[PDB]
Amino acid sequence: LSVCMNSKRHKQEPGPEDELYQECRPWEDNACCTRSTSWEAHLEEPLLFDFSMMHCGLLTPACRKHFIQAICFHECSPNLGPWIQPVVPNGQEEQRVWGVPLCQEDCEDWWRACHSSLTCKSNWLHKHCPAHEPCLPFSYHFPTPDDLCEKIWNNTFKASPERRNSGRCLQKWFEPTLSNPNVEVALHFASGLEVLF
Numbered sequence: 001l002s003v004c005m006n007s008k009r010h011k012q013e014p015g016p017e018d019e020l021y022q023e024c025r026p027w028e029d030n031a032c033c034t035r036s037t038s039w040e041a042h043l044e045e046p047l048l049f050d051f052s053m054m055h056c057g058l059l060t061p062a063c064r065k066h067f068i069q070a071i072c073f074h075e076c077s078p079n080l081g082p083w084i085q086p087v088v089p090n091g092q093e094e095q096r097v098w099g100v101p102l103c104q105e106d107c108e109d110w111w112r113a114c115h116s117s118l119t120c121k122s123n124w125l126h127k128h129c130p131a132h133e134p135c136l137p138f139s140y141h142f143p144t145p146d147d148l149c150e151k152i153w154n155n156t157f158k159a160s161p162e163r164r165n166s167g168r169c170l171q172k173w174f175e176p177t178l179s180n181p182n183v184e185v186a187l188h189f190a191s192g193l194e195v196l197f
């Protein structure tokens, strides 16, 4: 069984979407996001989410695409069940995800595409960069892809030591023509991976 986290944006239960904006397309088969949310995920300064683009200067389109894919994954993936946690324990009205293990390629590609960009914080989870915070290189706040994946959204993701096709990590994006590779990874974690064997 696949579920969606409780929030003011996510759908109650996973369901197919007829039209999702470009980067959120691979989840059209079974999504937790509405079409309105997927369009919001592509804005340069999105306001609907708890995240916020804390970048200064110019963000390259390749770097921005990885952020959008990460937002699509967080908003549309029906396979985040085993990492759902309450925003305020103990109550399940507001829910988040914690330590979703992203494969190394997803973190590395994200880190390399954003390597030349500038940011002002290492943790973007709550909307604009204040003038007193210096605009430092991406590689300073995130010296490794591990630091980027884990710190960018306050441990929303975990930097998995595994790589793609290992059955032990998730991809924040995949080709829409391909079958969703995260369905059986999430079920693997739901079946006791890394806590019981």
Ligand SMILES: *[C@@H]1O[C@H](CO)[C@@H](O[C@@H]2O[C@H](CO)[C@@H](O)[C@H](O)[C@H]2NC(C)=O)[C@H](O)[C@H]1NC(C)=O
Pocket (backbone or CB within 6 Å): 121, 123, 124, 125, 126, 154
């Ligand atoms: C994510 O982590 C950052 C840093 O750990 C938090 O930013 C801090 O926010 C509190 C007030 O909310 C203050 O200590 C400072 O404004 C921030 N400190 C630093 C070092 O930036 C942020 O609040 C966290 N967000 C969530 C949702 O947990």
